[PDB]
Curated annotation (Swiss-Prot), chains A, B:
Signal peptide per UniProt: none
This protein's record includes keyword Hydrolase: yes
Keyword tags: Hydrolase
GO molecular function: 1,4-dihydroxy-2-naphthoyl-CoA thioesterase activity
EC number: 3.1.2.-
InterPro entries registered for this protein in UniProt: HotDog_dom_sf (IPR029069), PAAI_dom (IPR003736), Thioestr_dom (IPR006683)
Family: Belongs to the thioesterase PaaI family.
Protein name per the record: Putative esterase PA1618
Biological source species: Pseudomonas aeruginosa (strain ATCC 15692 / DSM 22644 / CIP 104116 / JCM 14847 / LMG 12228 / 1C / PRS 101 / PAO1)
Keyword Transferase: no
Superkingdom: Bacteria
GO CC list: cytosol
Amino acid sequence: SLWRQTPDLEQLNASQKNSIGDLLGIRFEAFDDESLTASMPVDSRTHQPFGLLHGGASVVLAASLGSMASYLCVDTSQYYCVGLEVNANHLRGLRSGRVTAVARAIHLGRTTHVWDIRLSGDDGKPSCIARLTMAVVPL
Amino acid sequence: SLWRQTPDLEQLNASQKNSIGDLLGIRFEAFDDESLTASMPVDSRTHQPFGLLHGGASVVLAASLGSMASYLCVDTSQYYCVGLEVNANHLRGLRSGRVTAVARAIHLGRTTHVWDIRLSGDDGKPSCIARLTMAVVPL
């Protein structure tokens, strides 16, 4: 019921062709009535120079997730979504494995959306939190 | 005088090998007594699905720039830098060309650094602004 357009994981993944998403290994994984989930590897592709997960790389995952989520909540025959503001806190560093991100809606207004995005590594300990604000703009 | 270690553009660029930086085309361009500048193409590598500049991609550039800047302001025999908090506002969309980012220091404390990062396209109109907070942590 959150979703206007019921999420299509294959199409979500397919639509990332020729994008920064596909380039970093982002993969949409699951969704339910209230959330959307994507993951990304912690490797060379996403590494900052030190073999650590680039804060940016975590932020790309969060931004891709939340903007896609927003896109599935609007009437896309009449509206599109643009990023307005984004913030994030680094909670724990990540070395190897994959980072998983889960988006939940905080507020879906007529003109803005606010998404809460929680990230964690394979041990499932929170590694990053982000809040994303999108603008809903008439097509 | 801002810099402890005087910036080495070649080495800065070289150190990005096998990183998300090199993957997106980030290139350190210039520096002066008070600032560091890097650029990135607005293309397929950095595109969100719609042929637009992924907000993440702007944020990677800002994060790479500011963390590198922070790294050049600490005694690296004793300290390293970790991202704590980052935020950004989308100001104008970007279609083609390159986005240029300039980092300036807001505050360099003993335990935290705050960097102001201004981004703009080739028309030189501001496209994004970011503020980055790094932690300085004993090695």
